[PDB]
Nucleic acid binder design. Sequence first.
RNA 1: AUAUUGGCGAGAGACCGAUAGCGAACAAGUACAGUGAUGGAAAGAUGAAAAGAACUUUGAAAAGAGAGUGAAAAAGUACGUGAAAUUGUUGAAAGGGAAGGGCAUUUGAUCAGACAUGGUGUUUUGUGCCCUCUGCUCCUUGUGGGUAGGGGAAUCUCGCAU
RNA 2: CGUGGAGGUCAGUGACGAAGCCUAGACCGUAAGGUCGGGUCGAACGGCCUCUAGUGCAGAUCUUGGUGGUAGUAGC
Lengths: 173, 125, 267, 137, 125, 385
Amino acid sequence: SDEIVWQVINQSFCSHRIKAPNGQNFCRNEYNVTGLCTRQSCPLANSKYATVKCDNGKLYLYMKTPERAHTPAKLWERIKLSKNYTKALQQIDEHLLHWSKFFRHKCKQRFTKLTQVMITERRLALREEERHYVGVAPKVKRREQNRERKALVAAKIEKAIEKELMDRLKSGA
Amino acid sequence: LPHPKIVKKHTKKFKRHHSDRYHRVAENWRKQKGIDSVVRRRFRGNISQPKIGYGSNKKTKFLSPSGHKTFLVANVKDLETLTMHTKTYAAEIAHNISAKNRVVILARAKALGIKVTNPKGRLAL
Amino acid sequence: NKLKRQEIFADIKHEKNKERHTMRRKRAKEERENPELREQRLKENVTQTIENTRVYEDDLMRYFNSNSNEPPKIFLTTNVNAKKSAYEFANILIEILPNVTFVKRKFGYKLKEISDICIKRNFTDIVIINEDKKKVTGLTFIHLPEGPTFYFKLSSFVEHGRPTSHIPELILNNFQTRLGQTVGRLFQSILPQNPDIEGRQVITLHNQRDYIFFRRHRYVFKDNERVGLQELGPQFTLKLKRLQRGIKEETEWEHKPEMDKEKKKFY
Amino acid sequence: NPAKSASARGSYLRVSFKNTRETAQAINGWELTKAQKYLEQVLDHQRAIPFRRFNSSIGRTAQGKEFGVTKARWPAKSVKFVQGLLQNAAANAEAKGLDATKLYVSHIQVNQAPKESSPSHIELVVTEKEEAVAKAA
Amino acid sequence: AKQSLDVSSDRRKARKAYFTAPSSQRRVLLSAPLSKELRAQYGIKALPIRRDDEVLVVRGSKKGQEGKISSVYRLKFAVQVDKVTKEKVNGASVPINLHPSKLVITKLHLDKDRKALIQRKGGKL
Amino acid sequence: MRLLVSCVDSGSIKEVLCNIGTDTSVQSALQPFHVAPHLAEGLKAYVDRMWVISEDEAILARNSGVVELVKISKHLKPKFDISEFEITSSVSDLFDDAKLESLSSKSVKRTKLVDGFVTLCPIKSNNTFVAATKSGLLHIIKKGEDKKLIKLASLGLKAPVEFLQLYDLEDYIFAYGGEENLIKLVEIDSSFQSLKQIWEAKNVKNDRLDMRVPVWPMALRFLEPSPGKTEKGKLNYQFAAITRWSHLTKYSTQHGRKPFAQIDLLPNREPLSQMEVFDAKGENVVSSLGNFQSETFNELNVITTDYKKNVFKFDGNGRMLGKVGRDDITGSSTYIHVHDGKYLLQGGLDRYVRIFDIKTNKMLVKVYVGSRINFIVMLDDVEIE
RNA sequence: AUAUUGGCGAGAGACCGAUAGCGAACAAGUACAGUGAUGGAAAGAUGAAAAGAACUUUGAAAAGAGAGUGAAAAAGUACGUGAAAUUGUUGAAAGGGAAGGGCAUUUGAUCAGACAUGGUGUUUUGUGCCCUCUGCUCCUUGUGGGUAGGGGAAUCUCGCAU
RNA sequence: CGUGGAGGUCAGUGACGAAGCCUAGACCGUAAGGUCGGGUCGAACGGCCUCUAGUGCAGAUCUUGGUGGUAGUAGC
């Protein structure tokens, strides 16, 4: 039963539970809509669930029902949302007919967040960066410091400058 | 989000009594059990012992000055959990994460719009 | 046994050092008696320094480098959101460099757009610094008219005199290698090519193994046919990077960690 | 500036650490030739090493007026070790080609060593004095 | 997973045995694989390595170097290969120790005992 | 072996005559028998494309919009013979920078975008050659009985033109492309006075970010016609091209306009160019013009060099077979070529001429020339005693 | 069938890990002390490979200065890392028969201080998962999923690109 | 709150640097403590549910070890 599973996952070491310093428990399950391990939010403890996911740029409406609880292979019935904010929201509302207000509202919120996350193309389209984050290991740092000091010591910059000056102004102007 | 003004009720660490005077005494707080100890009797002019009074407000508890709760992140998968709580939680990269993974984590955080508490860690532009 | 090993070798070192001292004293005495033996020994013994153990046209100058036919025009700018350190370094760069007009990054003028505007504005070379922390970390020079770009890593920086109004004299050394001589020619062209003899000002770019030191001094010739010098200005190092043939196209050198493994063959 | 500086070090020397510190402080900041001459004079008791920190039960001598402290001493062994180290530093500088007349002890340090005796490590650095150069109108 | 009760899966016991193993056992320990070209010929993967054998270095800083074995240092669990030496700053040449497991045998020094061992190990000649 | 090296810094052809194992970097190794420059014209007129008509003649296409016919003679200076080069005839005024300058805007970088030759090979004995340019002007030059080069006709193409590969797997069709220019198949009339476009490529669907996939083919290599029945109207042609965005696009006119399979050779769309066809066993499986002599993509092994320093080898499925000269190449590989099906010519900004063994991926020759290398041709592989 | 802290030979630990574990991880019942019955410790680790600093030079002897191997000598046979008490040099501050701490503010020095940069609806052009015709393939069958071939924008803001 | 070890768990972290240490750095919790910023370091360790104890030091004229004032003093 869901209640037994809900109790077994609240306590008794649910696999995906993150103990944040604030005390909030964060769920890392991909199918979760809020990412938090709470009631009516964890897909495992809820026979009926709805979430929005996307492999490619297309956004899908993943939903779960008790019918496929016996068949974990094809539990979710994803449907394409025909990417467009207004019509996608209308389609989500139509699909989630008579569903809980919580599920509908949070699915719409997840879809909106994912759609606005697609703006990442803006950063990729207008980046023209000349820095490209570079990491330097401490071992490389040591070889770039002690060797530099040795080169400076062996260079004899003052002596070289004096020799060059004594040569330039000894055979011409 | 105009969150309530953060009030700490205290900004000085509750250093242990006589910690500065004696080196062997650690700064970690430890209640004085001495019956005749003046500190145990909270005499005037002595350090202030910790107590329930200094409790931080629930709404402002665990809130950084930027107004975002800190959350440790170990990889991209962990960072993905903050997709729906970007405005309330700030990603924090662990000290053991290498530069190779750190750059990838930072890129994904920027793509998702998740603020990074400690950027520029082991990474040079 | 740790104690046995420590004790046995402690006595061995003392005896070896005493024997070496006695032999050296006797050899010095014999050399004083017979100086020729010192010459014979020196002819066969060498200090084997790292330098001693090295492991082994006309259109180019006029095309990919500046010349005295026309005065160079150099464009100076800093990275986006640059801190005060970048401007402080640019203040020194403008004084050192000739005809430098500092500009502020506008956060959106692409490198291609910058090059196009410079062509419109008739700018010879573009110098852009890099700044990650609150210190200068990288220095880049590009010769805009079909010239290459040189990226330099600045590691050391610190700042006993005041430079005069006379143009410093440019001197170069240790540029035998084809890769090195290219950097030397770039430094000669970017720096002023019309020094003033009066003022006794010298600007030098010296490299020993691979790091190139930027130092400035004031020199005077003495009666002993020897010239002294005094510190004048900052002191910092540079390290070429990727030596791109174009503005940002094909890379020539691309100094990577793969190098420095041989501990020699410095470029 | 390592180019214009030379250093000499002495470690694991069976010498009185307290007297070594006093003589090092006395000879600190003095010119190489002047320091050597002062040490040589001390060898003959012409001048006395001023003792400031470790100066318990020290008599009053007229030679102390030079350094402003009446208490003074003549540590033969410590001064001998100091002058030997200075000679080693001068030889190193000569090998480096530095001008001896312009050398001065820019930094001299002494510290304890592994142990009833109290051996100490002594290290000093000799640097050529900076020379100013006139500008041009 | 082990099944015999006469074999102990103890790290301490294995470490003690390996370091205290005699020269006769160390001979079996110092075994190197044969080049696939030789494997097709003799139908054997690995054989004991001796002085007269010729081996090729496939791992380490000296990769791609091949030569005859000057000696077999059973005490140090390493072997020396001709033309693989470290030139000291004094001009002296010192062979570089190499573990047989990191070297590939290019040729084998045939003998009556070697041929008998090859035949016993299922090989062909 | 005897090789000719094109120098851009000096604008002269340098001849390399050395045996296998030569290495100028280390004195202990063998040194080249002889090396010297020939036909120096300066950086302004450096050689762009080269082709060996015969053992005693060759044709060059300099960057100054001039195509020259060069006579080759052999004479003694061990006791080896050096090569002397002389010019018999040439044709100039083959470049038009006006067409390319107008395209400077909207480009990637280097607003100059100077015109240059992209291909120089015979049309086929025939005495006819094709000289294409980045400006889209395709010129046909024929060596007549008078031994003087004459421009038979001039043809236009949609600039910019990064490459122009002809078809010769009979078992006059060529494919050309460029920045933001789809691959097009063009047929040339026998008279060579006009051309005809017959097929054009179609861009693949959008990427994950719902953004048009950039199109920038750099090289192409034709294959034999696909087997089986052919549909009416659709042509029967197969060709694989390498794009600057690291997309191993495979095309089949029999299937459709769109590529039937596109694979990312390297992540982050690393720059790539200098496509080549080779075999793991080092065989002359490529035609005279380099087209693969096969009717299947499963047997296609190619060599592509990135712009920074590396040279990559890829199979028909995009899998990487290993780098070439990873520990020796320290600069961009401007030009590569497979000679005789086993020798792999290499060169670039590193100012070094390298010969690699395809089968063993082992360097064989290393000769220092000083000037950057843009084209290498091996006249012969005969060793010298 | 029963016992077993000795002996030989084996298999294991929710055991300790160089001030712990048998007194003894190493020259441990060894040095050492006792006329003697007896008592009884301290001590592990360089580096992968000694490749253990070639050679020049100041040095009654010990240590240094150059120079050099090694990724590192910020690993020197006093060697895996180098904590507190303590001692020396330098920089800063304060001090008439000592000081330290707390509430509270001014000052030098010093640190942090976007690799933030767009959003909305309109106005052109080119594409696509968009319009149209013909198709292929998965489950089960649903308010579905995946994927090709031929045509276009003058219907086109359904998204993307300028 | 913290530590030694164990079962499970993060298809965890880590030679592109795990532990420890230093830090006139900041953040979080009233605190036990935890996180991150910078330097040395080099190869194991951690997020969380439970089990387990040779589990937390300011003293015991405490034990083992190291270092000072007295003091360059008495003294030889």
